[PDB]
Amino acid sequence: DLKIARIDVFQVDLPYSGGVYYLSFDATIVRITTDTGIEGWGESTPFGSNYIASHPRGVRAGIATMAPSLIGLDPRRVDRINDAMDDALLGHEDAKTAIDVACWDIFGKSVGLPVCELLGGRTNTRLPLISSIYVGEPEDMRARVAKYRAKGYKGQSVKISGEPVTDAKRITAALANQQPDEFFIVDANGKLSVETALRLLRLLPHGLDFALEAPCATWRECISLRRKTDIPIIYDELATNEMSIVKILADDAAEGIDLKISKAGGLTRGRRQRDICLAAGYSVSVQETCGSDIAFAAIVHLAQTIPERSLRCILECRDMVTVKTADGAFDIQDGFATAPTTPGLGIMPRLDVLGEAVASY
Amino acid sequence: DLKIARIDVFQVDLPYSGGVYYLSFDATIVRITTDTGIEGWGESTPFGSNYIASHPRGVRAGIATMAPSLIGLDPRRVDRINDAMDDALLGHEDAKTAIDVACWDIFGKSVGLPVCELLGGRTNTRLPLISSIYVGEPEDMRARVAKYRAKGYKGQSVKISGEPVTDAKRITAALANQQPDEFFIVDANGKLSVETALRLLRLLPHGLDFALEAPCATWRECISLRRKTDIPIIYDELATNEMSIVKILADDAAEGIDLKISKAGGLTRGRRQRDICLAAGYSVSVQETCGSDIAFAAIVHLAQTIPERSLRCILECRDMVTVKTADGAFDIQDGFATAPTTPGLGIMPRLDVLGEAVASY
Ligand SMILES: [Mg+2]
Ligand SMILES: [Mg+2]
Questions:
Q1: Which residues hold Mg(2+) (chains A, B) (predicted)?
Q2: Does domain B1-112+351-361 have CATH number 2.40.370.10?
Q3: Is some CB atom of chain B closer than 8 A to the CB atom of A84?
């Protein structure tokens, strides 16, 4: 009754809004067209190739291997589509993401409903945006946190380098005037060894309220650290597909996850993981490795289905870039947003920015 | 004093010697040339894209992302080369493999020594080849096991489907006349759920001597099963880089591993893992996902450095294909082989078979 007739891949250079990130992004955007003419869009944009086992060339290569096997399938059967992608290629959540998201776009358009409504129904609360406080001198970090607070942000992500003594001063300053209505995350991006994590935690003065995200690079190290601290731990890099989330629960390894759409594998896997976390009482932040307006659409729709008490902000990933790839109303107002109310993802890509497809199936 | 001047990538179709595998291979071969003219070779050939998170297009895409960063580095500093590959791209052991192996080839040629001698020194014992018994009717499997026994093979790998009742009959028949000098492996290739693994193990009659390889798809399932059985367990698909091997030890999860060169990340990582296993008392089989004569060279040199008591056969991966990519003397004789004694890997590629490079850096 409805079949995938074509899968087109586009490539877009997305300049970094921060100029240069020390220690532009190559975005992969996919358009799926059904036999009836409905078009759906999805995106997968890795944060370089050093964040997790993912890179731009890898995303497109993965799509090339899977795409042929998807032609003729019903895009509305999102779980079956994912089963099919899994049968064609193991892992590669980053390559599967854009395809899955596009199917959801088509799905919503086919029944005339916003994606969040097909994901269980939209909540009646707004979505808090989270700030990104890059590593710098303690006072600089504190000032930037203040700038965001003055813009209405209620969530802040403080990055650290991995050098415990200075990091301690950075966290102390960054949280200097934290308020009762703010949620703070200290993100180590897997840069701490257990030794360094313990040294950092022991150096911190009392009174600092935050959750520690991605403390160490490997599962073993994070578990080892978990046994020696009472600080809330959030998995990000190590939280990949739904099988990894179940492992977190089996190991009582953390208190929540940073659910990045393209690391999870799309909205379908995002839903699977959402339900695992909500069933367990884990907190969930919805973000992305990186991405334009299209990737942001997926973030907002998934987040709009997570009860406020369980949500830990969302990342307006498009803030990381300077090129607009699509139009959409996300109702942004002083640090908060809400999912659109039109069919599908609620976005309309700018074909001129996408250029001609780099691949077609 | 010695630097990488060029990295060329070749692609070779390798027809399956078994005709068609149910439920040809695309081989990636790399040639590294130093500024002084020394050439080294390496290979990475995935067993399709369903075995592990690896595919042909992915191997080459990974090389494209890493290669530029390697130009100018000393190929002899194998561990530093691997550190550099890690700095350019996380994971992707499959893409790193061919480059690492080629550096070892260069390394051995530069000092006029076989790779196994630079890996710690060759043992004085022969390397037993292992058979591959594809799934079939019980009697057919038993007959094929007999065929290999009659050829002098002392190692046998019996594959199963994942259907416990029939699998039990298959294992019973396949091992019907196993001898005192033979080592048997039953490989589930991660196809058993804990439920199915338990049902299979409970159905088997007493007296069957074998080690169970890759029983379940995920780490959690394998640990769960480990707690409910006393059968030796060997990790294959889940044994990836050295960090995973340390995790096996931390979890007391298995008795040994199936070390596949391209899954491990090359000879350097192979050495790292070898030492972890030998230090622990874990058994080690040296194989490959798939591969021609070049990939086979890496297998033999690593295996020739593992004490006989700890080795669990090697896979003559080239037996899986019908196209010869290089000449080399592996001293094959009735189910046994030994590493060559000439410099480097001891192989000379057939340039005519490789065709023109598909990529150059
Ligand atoms: Mg993070
Ligand atoms: Mg195996």
A1: 187, 213, 236, 258
A2: no
A3: no
